[PDB]
Amino acid sequence: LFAVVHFAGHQWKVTAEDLILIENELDVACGERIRLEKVLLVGADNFTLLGKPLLGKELVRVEATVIEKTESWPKINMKFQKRKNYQRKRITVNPQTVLRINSIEXXXX
């Protein structure tokens, strides 16, 4: 039994107890419990539910918890042009957020 959610313009496969990092900040305080939408649901009894262009809010639910807001290792981006004397060095650190998936809710209709 696993689900497929969508956030920050990126789709992800989520399962219970899983830890998933999402881009930047969700504007949510650490320790709080948030709900996410559902692109797809697949039950391990081989029973799949796929809605379009979204799944049932009443039918299925996904609830996860935010651990903290971290920062990925610094990436060095440099642009260089040959004999134009053009060199631009920029160090960019991508912000991230740690989400702990806790409860995947499935109810019968």
Place this chain on the structure above:
Amino acid sequence: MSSFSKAPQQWATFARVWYLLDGKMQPPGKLAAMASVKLQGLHKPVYHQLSDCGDHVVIMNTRHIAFSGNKWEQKVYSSHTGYPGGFRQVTAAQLHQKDPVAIVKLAIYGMLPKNLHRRTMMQRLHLFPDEDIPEDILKNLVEELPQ
């Protein structure tokens, strides 16, 4: 289970599966394409470029291969040595009359990507002009896709 921080999925490696391909009138080089697909492992959803997950393909009756058109006499295989004027032209006809298993193999030899994995997957390919397979005492999977 568990997945962490944007990672591609490959675990370790798996065991290759030996396949059998029939001869008798299938077009040369048309078989080499799919045989190269099986050689690379492009038919497997678990495929990886570096892992070299490709399988082992065994083809039979390579002399019974059939090339269309006038290309039988008109196809020229070039073999050149270091010595000056060592350029040799061998037609598909005479080559079939001498060493047929070379032909199809050459058709495969141009399909695969270069460098290492080419020869690596090339050693996974075996051809015979007639059917004798002691390796068939060892049970393998048979795939039939004639053209």
Place this chain on the structure above:
Amino acid sequence: XXXXXXXXXXXXXXXXXXXXXXXXXXXXXXXXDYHAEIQAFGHRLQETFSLDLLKTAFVNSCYIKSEEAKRQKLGIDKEAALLNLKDNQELSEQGISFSQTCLTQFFEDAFPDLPTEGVTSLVDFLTSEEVVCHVARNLAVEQLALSAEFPVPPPVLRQTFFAVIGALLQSSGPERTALFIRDFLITQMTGKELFEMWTITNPMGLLVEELKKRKISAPESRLTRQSGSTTALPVYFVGLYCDRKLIAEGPGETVLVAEEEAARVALRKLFG
């Protein structure tokens, strides 16, 4: 100034070839007091009581013996710390017992279909020293632990951890403890190792015992097919059934290993 940076670079380069041992008293930079630690300990966790028992939980016999030793050596004055250890050992005793009872209740309620041997194995693995001590070190209990000789060694941190357990048992009661421990241990397991350590000896025979005990049916292994490979490993397809009904099927390199894995999958299959 260049002198301060040369001295900082020389100290940072001197620390590479020389590694000093970890000290417990000089560990924290700020002054370490009992009340500060127990206050933060009370603010983080839900409920915390019995500050005396909590402080006693991080007290070890080695520190007391060393202290009394220094008292005898110097001979300046004489004080009695004796009550601490005597009060701690009891909390540890009750702690171990109640931990066993609680975990037994957990395995009883969660997995009723689990045989006695499986219960014993899982309890032995869950109460194991290495795992619990690992959880300890991961929870940074070693920072709150007081050890004169060395902070690192497991006999300190483990007994300290159990003392903390018992302390939570007496002070906060069972209802809180059941919340605390049950959360961590499960999250720690995560593996197949749970049933693997019980499978270390005659997997087939164990399956025979389970089947004969439950459905009273002798397991039968039958080869359903074989796909050979001479080079790396041959693949044999081995079925395992009872009363003509197939329980499981699986591939193997050798007949023995194939039967082992088939018996393992069938072992976890009857676990539910």
Place this chain on the structure above:
Amino acid sequence: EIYHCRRQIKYSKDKMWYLAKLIRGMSIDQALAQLEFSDKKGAQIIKEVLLEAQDMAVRDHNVEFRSNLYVAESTSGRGQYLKRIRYHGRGRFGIMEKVFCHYFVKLVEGXXXXXXXXXXXXXXXXXXXXXXXX
């Protein structure tokens, strides 16, 4: 451990390194015999270094059994260079560099054990099965 060093001696470092690697790992006796009957300029010098190392081993460390001594490490460093003028034709002068070698010898007690034997079939069957499972 018994250390011995010789500095400010003038010989080719690359040439001395030949006899330096020769006695490395070898026992005291075999190294002695070798250096004795080895033909080169470094033979005598390294023989002297070895002899002095043995004398220091016996006298200073008071070793009970001389057979328990072997050569653990031997190395050759480069010292200062003496610049000389080599006269050539057509009024040109080349620079002849006279080199130097600092010989260092490190000895450790106990019986010498060195195994260069490696089974090909075992190593292959292990490394392949471990690489295929990773």
Place this chain on the structure above:
Amino acid sequence: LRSRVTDRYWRVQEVLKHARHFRGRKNRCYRLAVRAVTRAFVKCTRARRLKKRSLRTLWINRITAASQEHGLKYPAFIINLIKCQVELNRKVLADLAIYEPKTFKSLAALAKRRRXXXXXXXX
């Protein structure tokens, strides 16, 4: 009057600190270290740009394989998924194409169903 002091030596020390694990004089000499560092950063940017392309191609190959196992090709599967209003990315689709053959089998079944219904409605 000023001095060269430790500035240049510290800059060189930093560049060489970033020049570690490099081969030859490039992990030793300063100039070659810089020359290799520039190329290293350019390659960093370019490979980080083409990484998405490589992953996309790989995923497309995997999905193509899993599709061909069911008797249909990749483009037909894509079209069917488009007309099925499925916005699912090829990454997750490939992950399902590997770990969960059942879901991909269902999607392929619906694909063949939509294709047969369109071919029957067009006739």
Place this chain on the structure above:
RNA sequence: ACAUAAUCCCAAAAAA
């Protein structure tokens, strides 16, 4: 009909 080893970028193929 030009002068070192072939094919006008691999191998082949066919006539949305």
Place this chain on the structure above:
RNA sequence: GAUUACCCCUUCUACCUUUUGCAUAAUGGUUUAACCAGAAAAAAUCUAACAAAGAGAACUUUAGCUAGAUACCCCGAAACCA
């Protein structure tokens, strides 16, 4: 980038100078350390002082005058003369 505590596979035509255009089989460099090549305010813009006056016995002035702050780097001849 992946991948294993190492590597093979995949993605990329040195730097500088000179040029319409150089990875170029155009130029310079063995490497390293160190040395080494934009220092001139008239009119102007700008910050302040006072204002038909400014400015330390000198000049300017139909809003000026005074002060401060802003832009124009090195090496090399063949030869001439004493």
